[PDB]
Amino acid sequence: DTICIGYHANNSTDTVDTVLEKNVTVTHSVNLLEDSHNGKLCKLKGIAPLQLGKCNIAGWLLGNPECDLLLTASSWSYIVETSNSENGTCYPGDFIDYEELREQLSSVSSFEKFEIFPKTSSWPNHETTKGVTAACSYAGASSFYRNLLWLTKKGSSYPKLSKSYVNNKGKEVLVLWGVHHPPTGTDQQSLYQNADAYVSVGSSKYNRRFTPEIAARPKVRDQAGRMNYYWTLLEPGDTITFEATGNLIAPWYAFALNRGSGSGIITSDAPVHDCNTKCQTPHGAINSSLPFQNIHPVTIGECPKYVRSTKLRMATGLRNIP
Amino acid sequence: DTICIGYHANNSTDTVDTVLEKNVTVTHSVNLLEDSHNGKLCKLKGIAPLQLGKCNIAGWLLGNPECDLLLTASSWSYIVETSNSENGTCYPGDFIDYEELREQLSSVSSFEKFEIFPKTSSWPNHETTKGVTAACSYAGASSFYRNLLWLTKKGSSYPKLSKSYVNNKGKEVLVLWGVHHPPTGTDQQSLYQNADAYVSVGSSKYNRRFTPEIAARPKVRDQAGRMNYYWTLLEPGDTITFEATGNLIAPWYAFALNRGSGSGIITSDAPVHDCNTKCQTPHGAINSSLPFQNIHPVTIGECPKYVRSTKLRMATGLRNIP
Amino acid sequence: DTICIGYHANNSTDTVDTVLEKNVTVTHSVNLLEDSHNGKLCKLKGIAPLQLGKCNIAGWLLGNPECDLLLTASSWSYIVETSNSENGTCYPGDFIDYEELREQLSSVSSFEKFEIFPKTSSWPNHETTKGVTAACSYAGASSFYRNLLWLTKKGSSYPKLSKSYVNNKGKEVLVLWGVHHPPTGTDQQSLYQNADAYVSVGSSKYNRRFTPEIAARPKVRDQAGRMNYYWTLLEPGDTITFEATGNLIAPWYAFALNRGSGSGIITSDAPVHDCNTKCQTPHGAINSSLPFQNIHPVTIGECPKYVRSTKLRMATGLRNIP
Amino acid sequence: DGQQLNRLLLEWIGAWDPFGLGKDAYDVEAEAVLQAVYETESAFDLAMRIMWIYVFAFNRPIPFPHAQKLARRLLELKQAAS
Amino acid sequence: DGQQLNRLLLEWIGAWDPFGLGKDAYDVEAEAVLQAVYETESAFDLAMRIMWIYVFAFNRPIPFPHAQKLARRLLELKQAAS
Amino acid sequence: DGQQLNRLLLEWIGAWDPFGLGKDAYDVEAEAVLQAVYETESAFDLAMRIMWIYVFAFNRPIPFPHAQKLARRLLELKQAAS
Amino acid sequence: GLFGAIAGFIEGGWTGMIDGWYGYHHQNEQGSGYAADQKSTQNAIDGITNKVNSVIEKMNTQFTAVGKEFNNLERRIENLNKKVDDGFLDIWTYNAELLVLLENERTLDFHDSNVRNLYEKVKSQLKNNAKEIGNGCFEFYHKCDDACMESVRNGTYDYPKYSEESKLNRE
Amino acid sequence: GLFGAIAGFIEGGWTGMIDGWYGYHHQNEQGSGYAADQKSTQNAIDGITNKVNSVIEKMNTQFTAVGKEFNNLERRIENLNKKVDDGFLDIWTYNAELLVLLENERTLDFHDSNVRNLYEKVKSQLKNNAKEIGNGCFEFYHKCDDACMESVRNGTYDYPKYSEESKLNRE
Amino acid sequence: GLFGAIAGFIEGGWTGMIDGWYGYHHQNEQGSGYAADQKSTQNAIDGITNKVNSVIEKMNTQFTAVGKEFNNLERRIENLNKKVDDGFLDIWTYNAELLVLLENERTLDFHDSNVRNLYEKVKSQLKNNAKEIGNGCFEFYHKCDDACMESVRNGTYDYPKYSEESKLNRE
């Protein structure tokens, strides 16, 4: 009679690497590396992302006429730019501190747009209707940004304007405006009458004065002129004051911002779909409890640690020897 | 007769974690994680810290009248701001490159303040005594910064001034000054007479020209005007030259800086006490030779590595089995 | 009769450290830490480095007259500054965004210099020959940068100039220019005639307007005046337009840039030699397949990981017991 | 059929409730256990899958024998309907 | 009493001077050893505390038997006054 | 002499070609093997050097016995000329 | 490999023993069969699960991390940013691949240890009442029916009882 | 647990042996008592102290590290800064908690090893002059007074001397 | 030290055995000599090479990394940069010095294990056909010429053949 000691083996083909040998077959193991995704863009916390499409952040917030789909947008879980987000500033010029603005936005989860200076009642002494350009066509007509108002001379005069806004929305307000720089002195006169015009803007934190830089530059979208775009976050209770004797592209709509965490801007050409996920990447969503992923370093939500590895399988059972 | 092999056990209750099991009782162990502090702010190298109290760095260096306790300060081991360090610039305006200045200061261990341009003898053609404001009251009277001198028109004229300083102190000198921007043209005239005034400042490294930006802004501390504050580090042997036809708030006292390492600015509401330590954090000092601490990531001196852990006990003895 | 089991020993003196004991003698081991270098600066991919010698990057690109050896330079594997690279801007002033420019250059492996605005034919209405200074002497004569052209008044007039360049080189072009700031109004008149002069420069991306800041500053290299230097990368197909009524130091030569990776600027006083290496550091080259090195944290090419260690020897054989 | 067997197996997995979270807190983990069930006939392999499933989701080790008990009921039930 | 016993035990700990630093270089470590002394009666536990005390402070391993010798003198002395 | 012995030993090392890279791809590693050859008389020590030489250069483990075969030829040859 | 048992003196596993990691094969007059050791297996599993949880829980699930944008004059900060990202990534990749490698060695060795200790557990219980073949097998010098077997698995085998009987047959 | 000795074939420790980590319990006609093995203990300690010093000394005491401030237009650099700080912290926390965990396993196993080697050290010295009970105990087949005991602890026990005497009693 | 063999029950190495890491010393009537065990050695080497490759290949050769320059108003970013560099360096230095330390322990223990397993490999083959001296030596109870030796090294030693012959001499 006899008794023997022994250990389990099975038909398992799982292999793992160890420090002394590679490609070792074991009886059980666990994969620690998620390497699969669903190729779509999904909701998070059940909120759909904002797909900007052909517009970019600048084009969105100014209301480039090419961006009318975005006019109704108010909450999103994150923001998606694509390879074709080319509609931004349609009138050529610099958008000042643009990268910082995007950063601010990476932590805004929703907002309420509102009419800061109603076109019809705020500007009784200035022209509000000739401020369109072939540079911002829409339906083949000269048109303009939906969130800004281009003021020009009435008859043959541009009197000094002074307009202030007090923030009673209970949260930060994003205010955008522009400063126009005609290419010639005679053009300056045609639009604003005054050669020595300036724009001054002030609140508790922002305080800047701008003057027109008139000069010939190469034409961009047919325009030898330029327009600069500026923005500020008006703190609760704060006031913003605009003063100008010309060249001001005044705010029309502004944005009361709701802050969140875990929001962000991603760039992806993957289709948005109605699925829901806890972790989103630019290639597609991940539905995983694995500690690691090698899908993408950019993630929104709660995700596995990104690593370059192609394989992380930890043996749990023993060397498999049938 | 018999002989047995065995191992020590005792009444030790110390437990440690291992990779195969948690809460294992062992016969001896060492804690590697300091998690206790003395709740006070102490000296380092026997030098007491500088407690700024209600002032902040800006308020200190300009000599906000609310900061007179700091007037006598010259060496410190580190600098302490509190939750109430609100006395900074009492005349509203921007302090230019303020965060950088704080960074410079984080490596200054001591200084000698001195009278760069003596009020009584440097400015024979200008008014030095009307440059006070209700914005910087002190004892209910209009007053002003102790380290700056507000020059104004004498009778009805502000002649062009030109004043230079040569650095013979053998070390870097911190020079501060301001540029004033009245809210109206008529106010400009009242103070400085000249509508077209400017301020120009130059040394080997710094070179800037400023002109007044006159405009209405919301009132801050009763003031619709603004004042900008500037600073520079004047290198050894270098000269600084001020030129102005108005609007200059001239240096009065400046600072010859002694550099050290291991200094810093911390923010803490913990009481300063007369104890001495090798390692200071914003919660209190640590007197430890342990390699780790979980007390605070901000430290001055020589400290254990901060980690988020609540427990790091390394077994030294064996599994305890009585 | 008898049979015994045993293990190898030899006369090896190699020691290694283990976690339980130090200085353990083993029968075989491998060093993982390269700690030796050849003390010379070498070629990479067979391309010699650019040794700037007494000039620095600024001095090189402007063509400080002290830098004529560099005039013929066109490709390099990396760039070497020494402890004596002091010849930069010989006319005192600020080189704007200089650190960024160096960064751009850290990824340029070669270039073709060319005559953007030929001195002899581009400027028929302006003086090109009186623009020399004792501040940039060369052979004891007033001289000037080789890559820039100092324009001045012809007879007693400086008419408005307007000059544009279109980029047809198929790659980025580095364009440099300057803006001059005389110390006095009368000096301004002597050189440029016009008191109210300006310089305006524009392309698709760069757009700036400069005006002269006339004021007395301490003399530097005999000069109370100042000159500012500017640069831009003109993208393919883009145009750059200069306009001025004075004070412009115009581009003469510019650089079509060839990008590479793995290039860089190092500072070293080690002699350049004709050897070839795969890994270069500021102390000397490393010819190694070891994973680590403790020679220097700055490296060009493919290098071992820098670590502070003095010893990393991994035992391979066993404890040596003869 | 599976439609009914699937609904029951899922109800049970939730009801197991190893962490006192309520039957509805384990819906994700339950599907993973169901899936794993159709992939084997050995109570031991399955007992191993479950414990792993729940350790990733919850960072908490389930007693082996407790897990082992659940697996036995499920494979008995799989065979009982098949 | 402790006042006198405390002063002597401290003088000695400094005098032990394992690293040739002078008796006054070990004042911090000496208090830690004194404290540890009143916490035990086993020479072995105490020998272990000391070595640890000195390893953290100085990053240097004291020979076990050398440490063990110091502990024996101190516990003999603690009992001798108590 | 070495001049001729050096050229031959080097030709061979390249020809060994453990990774199918051509004889000329191993010039650096071959010198390292040549150097190592003049430093020992034990085939085993040398077999160890080679394998290490090639593992650093190529991140690939050479079969021990294959390496061991090369070393035997080289030490036989070193002695044969000396 | 460290303890000489798995793929050592016990050359192979039992594709046939499906209820546990370690166990017994018994042959007497009354019949054969396979039996896993719950205690050995139960201990190994609590152990391995804990090894794995410690590894997973130490890993911060990664919360939102997205790119930053920089303008064409922010090339230095842009590179600093990239240096940060890549450096942390070299590290997490390195610790992770290396950790798994090292831990896999330890896990497998852990199993070798469990088996060996089980063999020697049995060996010390039986003593001279059996001989060691040397392949994880013991031959009895007495009849050991299924009742006797059970005592052996669950640890309570009685040596004195059979020491006499076994002493006769053996010599 | 790896070597089967601590909490294995020697089921329990001796709350009674206070002068060392490993040792002996002896019973003869002349009296009992407990005795620690200095060499075994001395070796284990130099070992563990070194394990601990290597861990501590590798740790740069942290010299001054304080926050930076950034303005409301330096939000990107501000976040870059925070990303740096937290990332290094995830890492130092992770290496540290994990290192201690792994090292604790090794330390305890180190002790198991020391004990086992001590048992088998004694076992190989005595041989057939005693039998193994199987619980860290040996029974002598001859009278071993306290003099004999000492030889055993300090390694110099003489087998031939008692091999005859022991041979008679045993059979 | 863990397995008790190297610098343990086999007190010393053989400066004389130059063809391998582990092996045999044999003495019979027909002559002595030293013989390395290729299989034991071959296995240890593939193992150690792999341990070393995994360590090296995990290490990104360092591609171009050069300093950045910052102006006298970029002191914060300058310090951020330096904080990044030094932090990664503390880490790579720390992992590296510590990794080698830990791995060296494991490598040496690996060798101890290989030797012990070799001893016990032989021990289980011979059984009572020889006695254990206790110093890595076995004494035969029968004549074992060089032919017999070879069978032992390469694993095929025949016990039954000599079991009778050995049984007579031994008793």
Ligand SMILES: *[C@@H]1O[C@H](CO)[C@@H](O[C@@H]2O[C@H](CO)[C@@H](O[C@@H]3O[C@H](CO)[C@@H](O)[C@H](O[C@H]4O[C@H](CO)[C@@H](O)[C@H](O)[C@@H]4O)[C@@H]3O)[C@H](O)[C@H]2NC(C)=O)[C@H](O)[C@H]1NC(C)=O
């Ligand atoms: C929204 O984004 C879309 C693209 O994503 C953008 O559409 C583009 O409009 C521009 C601007 O007019 C088009 O550019 C022109 O293309 C034609 C033919 O291809 C050229 O002839 C034009 O250049 C001529 O004139 C230039 C100026 O003087 C000269 O420099 C040049 O040499 C030529 O003479 C000009 O390049 C562009 O083709 C479209 N693209 C598409 C695909 O529609 C649209 O403008 C954006 N809308 C807004 C309002 O933001």
Ligand SMILES: *[C@@H]1O[C@H](CO)[C@@H](O[C@@H]2O[C@H](CO)[C@@H](O[C@@H]3O[C@H](CO)[C@@H](O)[C@H](O[C@H]4O[C@H](CO)[C@@H](O)[C@H](O)[C@@H]4O)[C@@H]3O)[C@H](O)[C@H]2NC(C)=O)[C@H](O)[C@H]1NC(C)=O
């Ligand atoms: C040193 O710091 C202290 C605080 O730490 C600071 O004390 C503050 O002084 C200010 C400035 O005058 C006080 O603010 C006022 O509070 C009263 C009543 O609470 C308000 O009526 C005032 O606002 C009126 O006027 C404003 C301007 O037109 C209007 O906008 C507003 O709607 C009101 O009509 C004003 O807010 C503040 O209360 C104190 N705080 C304390 C606790 O003392 C002191 O000024 C600093 N000193 C210096 C010189 O740096």
Ligand SMILES: *[C@@H]1O[C@H](CO)[C@@H](O[C@@H]2O[C@H](CO)[C@@H](O[C@@H]3O[C@H](CO)[C@@H](O)[C@H](O[C@H]4O[C@H](CO)[C@@H](O)[C@H](O)[C@@H]4O)[C@@H]3O)[C@H](O)[C@H]2NC(C)=O)[C@H](O)[C@H]1NC(C)=O
């Ligand atoms: C190329 O780089 C070299 C150095 O690497 C540089 O050479 C330097 O030229 C300067 C500028 O003229 C020299 O500086 C002078 O030195 C003399 C005597 O040492 C001083 O008298 C001069 O200062 C006087 O005038 C100053 C201005 O008013 C006063 O402030 C001062 O107090 C004195 O009165 C002045 O400092 C310098 O010595 C040399 N160095 C060497 C070693 O050659 C050269 O200029 C660079 N060339 C170019 C064109 O880039």
Ligand SMILES: *[C@@H]1O[C@H](CO)[C@@H](O)[C@H](O)[C@H]1NC(C)=O
């Ligand atoms: C692992 O070995 C298997 C066969 O057992 C083979 O299919 C596979 O390609 C091997 N992998 C590597 C990379 O060695």
Ligand SMILES: *[C@@H]1O[C@H](CO)[C@@H](O)[C@H](O)[C@H]1NC(C)=O
């Ligand atoms: C460790 O077990 C002890 C009792 O032995 C208990 O007091 C303590 O709460 C346990 N800790 C944990 C978190 O398991």
Ligand SMILES: *[C@@H]1O[C@H](CO)[C@@H](O)[C@H](O)[C@H]1NC(C)=O
């Ligand atoms: C290692 O010991 C050797 C002598 O065996 C000695 O030369 C060397 O200095 C020792 N190193 C250290 C730092 O202990």
